[PDB]
């Protein structure tokens, strides 16, 4: 192995400008990092800049350096979706040609009729809601009738709530497996079905820990699967294990915040593993992009950048650090959805004694997966082209 350890960091949603196909996704004008930098009157990410961020693209406060520490370029998404699952699946060697559906006016009647027919229970609600709100609204009716509450969010989710005394947990889990099968159809294709059992009574309903999730498996064997199969470590930090439905994961390190995720990254630098340590930093997307909060996004980016020196100091000569994103989510764009953007790519090892250079633009995010696969001598993904031998 050329590198013993690869540390891969996805700054979730940290896009570096509208992609060539942004118009088809309603995303003309989008620029995540750029528009944050404008809002801040200069974004301050001095560690990312020394890696080469400004050499990718100069932005306010983000300037070129003569001798970047690592290699730098951007990557273009090939897959049809701009969601977190698609972007991550593509990073790890896949090509996804159907989108995950969302249902802002509720699920279509034909899907709900099928679910009612197969379960023998009637369905109520059928709208975007928070869990708390929909129980307050419909919990009593659900208890009294034995119906199922089906609700969704702005994300590709189908959630089914029922009182544990009224619909036994075993049946609720069977109902969700049925729903999971029905939602494999391309017209109804949802990212995750979630069992939402609750207890209590009107004015005091509680969602129980008996929640279970039925996520879609990645559409093919990933580079993570190949690493785990070949007896390497695959250390998933944060939402990574969920995004891949555990496929190829050997250790899952749960996190509660971006700073907790950088702590866990450091924990893995301190571990004697051979393989991949893979971090998702989700707060960028969930708290700043989706909430259209550019000031918050800028502060969060600055906080993240201030953690990098500690990472740099613990990298060894045969370690490689890769920093990228999975899509954009421009916090001044209309609506609340992701934005179809190029993503940055920085590749740094302290063995780069001459500093890095510009890499050719990556035509698919799967170039990351292909590089990781070539490094560890595992079977090459069907999509992507390695840049291992250019480092
Ligand atoms: Mn848009
Ligand atoms: Mn994402
Ligand atoms: Mn999102």
UniProtKB/Swiss-Prot annotation:
The record's section on InterPro entries has: Alkaline_phosphatase_core_sf, DeoB, Metalloenzyme, Phosphopentomutase_DeoB_cap_sf
Q: What is this protein called?
A: Phosphopentomutase
Give the chief site where it resides: cytoplasm
Q: Which domain of life is it from?
A: Bacteria
Reaction catalysed by this chain?
2-deoxy-alpha-D-ribose 1-phosphate = 2-deoxy-D-ribose 5-phosphate; alpha-D-ribose 1-phosphate = D-ribose 5-phosphate
List UniProt keywords, sorted A-Z: Cytoplasm, Isomerase, Manganese, Metal-binding
Give any single GO term for biological process.
Answer: 2-deoxyribose 1-phosphate catabolic process
Query: Which gene is the coding source of this polypeptide chain?
Result: deoB
Subcellular location field: Cytoplasm
What CDD domains does the entry give? PPM
SUPFAM superfamilies given in the database record: Alkaline phosphatase-like, DeoB insert domain-like
Q: Which Pfam families match?
A: Metalloenzyme
Q: In which pathway does it act?
A: Carbohydrate degradation; 2-deoxy-D-ribose 1-phosphate degradation; D-glyceraldehyde 3-phosphate and acetaldehyde from 2-deoxy-alpha-D-ribose 1-phosphate: step 1/2
Can you quote a single GO CC term? cytosol
**EC number(s) on file:** 5.4.2.7
Per the entry, the cofactor note is: Binds 2 manganese ions.
Sites binding Mn(2+) 2 sit at: 285, 290, 338
Report the sequence similarity comment from the record: Belongs to the phosphopentomutase family.
Q: What cofactor does this protein call for?
A: Mn(2+)
Residue sites binding Mn(2+) 1 per the record: 12, 326-327
Q: GO terms for molecular function, please?
A: magnesium ion binding; manganese ion binding; phosphopentomutase activity
